[PDB]
């Protein structure tokens, strides 16, 4: 059987079993349609249409099942023609970034807007987590780059490019002693229980440094991996949150009070990192540059070319980067 | 767009994108085929196949939507012929079943006798194979019905009807250590070399779960698709076998000891199913019922009407299926 | 054999067979580690690690049997500290929980508040992550409890306890073609580009299952680990989000519209669990009951003494769990 | 704490609080046991025993629980020592073969047996299937070696080495008409229902070639993949079996009558085969040579270097093959 035979038997039913009438619709003759039908009835071995002399009187019970299915065939044929083009698929390559929740939320939905306009068929996948995790993803090859925020010693064995410098903040509820205060000392901060990052205190961080030169041990009551959680816990108890400054601003967090700790802890440096051996696709260079405007392709090449991260440190040394 | 064109692109895929194989198989010429494909690719304005040179390397994304509808179309045309034959000679046709070696030997002979009694003019064709091979057989047209014994995820696109639950045994020769301990733990078993199915360990079977659970790795010295192969292996060496209980008889197999493993591996479930597109002739319902007494015509038509195989399981929540 | 040696070979697997990483992380010398490890292979007569030069390529098969037991040893040693801690001062200690961003933000504040009130001397620590990352957190010993939301096969080696069932919503901008259709089939959805978790599509998820059932492949333009990041992506573009209903509120998020997907994807079960080796302290039973009311002290110890997580689900058949 | 302390507290209860008996039994001093136990008591910050003067009187409530775990801890340290050596794994490489049931079980039990002993740490994997499935297994890369029995045109583009030559028998129940017929004829056979392989009649097989050149068209009532399954069914009615003669003998199949059919159908050739790019190992060359003694290492290698499949058959022209 052929598609054409199927069209014909569905059209003959559309046009009242008026075989003459059918043919006008479809630019052919009565002994043409009539021939293809009689052929199919012979192939299948059963009559689709009961017949009084020459006139067709009605569709047979077998007839009716067959026409019903033939309508489906036709429906599915048209469906084939309707299939979307290859343009509708994100199959031109994919970018896997490992970073933090703050990196993903704040720095990045102005960059990612910009990147998806430039590359509509390139899929993007943001992994989250601790520094340990962000590092493991790149080196195990389950992510192409890390945007690293701290504990940069774990991204030894990658290539690491400076993006910007960042500073932490003491966030408290509006009710809190600290909320209306000429700044805050390290000793004042060691007084209240701390809500910080899981990896906030490790033994070697900027938080451990500050508490260790002052001889204070801090009381840690709650920790979590992402700032959102920390802020959210800071609607509960005399606890004092320490998080990145760029993870709280007064527009979107008015139940909350950002206070300076730049005196108290040293700055951290966000870097974008990847494996020596990684082919840098066009969209890889575009992402790097959007996120951090000074890392153009010429700049990224100059740095991959150097012997190690020691030298890359010597490259940027006297370059002033943004604070965020 | 011609039906012969949808047969070609489908058959190409059924033959690993090898077009010379496709031709041998369909008794037509390679140029003819490649030609039809290039015309359809042109009519639709959509590359279906990625190409290297002359070679076809893969099915493109848009390409897959096309192939999927094409298979539908083709199975509908088969449905027409099938409907014509029911109305012409109800008791005359052929039944194509894919299932395992064990089902063919231990679940079905009894049923197949009684079926052939009832339907002398219905030719029965039983493909043996792995779960994957069974799924393949229906996917590729060689099989109206599948009796799945496990790895039921491989059939999410079929209607699948529960038949019975079944449990595995440990099988050794009577001179084996484990013969006269007659109370085996997962920890005891994992010492020994294992002789099981090729698809026994797949990452997600019940054997997988039981070892993962106890944190062990199996020692696999030998596998086979077929339980009879496994058993005649076990008659030589120091392997321990893990096969369906119903595959070992105290009568037929008294050189093999059969140990209990209900308290190690969870039971599997056998199901019988078919593409939703498949016209169910009266002899089909018979067969189903003779295999699984609770799968009456009503029950089967009710099941088919539902939308998931999970909803079909909801239908049998208050009924406790046989244990084999 | 020494405890210190077992910590070394296990913390070595933990840092991906990387010995100077193991060193840095445990404030100690690298050869100290190498010499302990060679000593243990010596003492056991078994190579635990494949070697090349002075490089560690993989864990040997008999080597893995040894690590798996080591991990047990150490986690039992930590129990002895915990039994001591309990008997000395019970209301004091720490609790490490690994779960998802969505459970930390939308299921736990109110359980956490209640908990910190009762146990001000118990520091609480919430790891966020993928289902993979949660299993890992308990495996490595950085977590006492897991609160898993899907992919429960990843915790077959844990006592897992059902808490509640949850569902997915399709989320879109209030001007997307889908908002005023109120009526989405999987076919309609599959047209669109998808935004969803990094672990949305894995081959065996509930998302995978709906698509395989309908023969369709999803268009995936962006994934994130974190449901919030998905949410703010969906506030920009053309793509449709697929996330837990409970990550989207009419008042939390009025800029997003939340469409029924109950009839597309099957529900998932949230569960809470922990290594069998873990000693359960008084605040731990407490944490568990505060999260899942039906999970009482008696219930938990009953669930522990069973043998699998299916048998544990068996216990809550004659009881409908909350839906979320 | 140290394993030694845990051994000590454990061992002290075994010797019923007698430190002296302890020292004798573990070959150590009383002062050193007593010191190590105080040490653990300090570390843990709790007493594990009560004291009368200097002797030891009773165990504490916490002690009771610490000892419980201690025993467990020790028992696991034992299990490390008892781990089976690197020899008990079959991890020296594995051998995957795609062939038929017949081949597996009537040619190979004796060829495997010999291959196993020589290579006890080489795992052996026996995929079954139809000719078309056997060829895929290899080309795809789920098996190294196919032992093909017929329709050798599917294994073009693989290296195929002739092994031997085989013919078919008619097979019947002792109650069948042909059971005691002086010979049997292409016409007599055709008048009967036929029971044969699924791929028995293809359009171009030795069964087609025979029935086609006599203008007979056969009735086929049942087909299966395996000969074993073909044999079983032939306890029914009027059906005639057509299978390989090597898969039936009167001693182990006395229920059936093996009646000759060399007049009716020409012989096929069994061949063993692999992909060109396959790196042949030693246990590879061995299995080949145990299966077909003419296929020595040097012959295989000559064959693989040759130009076409053409020449390969010509290499065996003057070499008479076994007949089975
Ligand atoms: C600036 C930044 O993103 N910092 C991390 C913390 O290192 C964060 O997750 O907030
Ligand atoms: C019950 C059954 O047939 N089980 C399969 C294994 O999945 C077999 O072939 O033995
Ligand atoms: C209910 C829940 O927490 N869902 C997970 C996904 O399983 C999430 O991270 O949103
Ligand atoms: C001789 C042989 O093995 N023949 C196959 C069929 O070609 C069989 O399975 O019996």
Author numbering:
A (entry chain B), B (entry chain C), C (entry chain A), D (entry chain D): 1 to 324
From the manuscript:
Under conditions of sulphur limitation and in the presence of the inducer, N-acetylserine, CysB binds to cys promoters and activates the transcription of the downstream coding sequences. CysB is a homotetramer of 36 kDa subunits, each comprising a smaller N-terminal DNA binding domain and a C-terminal effector binding domain. To elucidate the subunit arrangement in the tetramer, we determined the crystal structure of intact CysB in complex with N-acetylserine.
There are two protomer types in each tetramer distinguished by the juxtaposition of the DNA binding and the effector binding domains. In the tetramer as shown in Fig. 1D, the four effector binding domains form a core from which the DNA binding domains project in pairwise arrangements, A-D and B-C. The interface between subunits A and B is extensive at 1540 Å2 with 45 residues on each chain participating. The interactions between chains A and D, equivalent to those between chains C and B, are dominated by the packing of the linker helices. To investigate potential larger scale structural changes, we performed a normal mode analysis of the N-acetylserine bound ABCD CysB tetramer in the H3 crystal form using the tools available at WEBnm@.
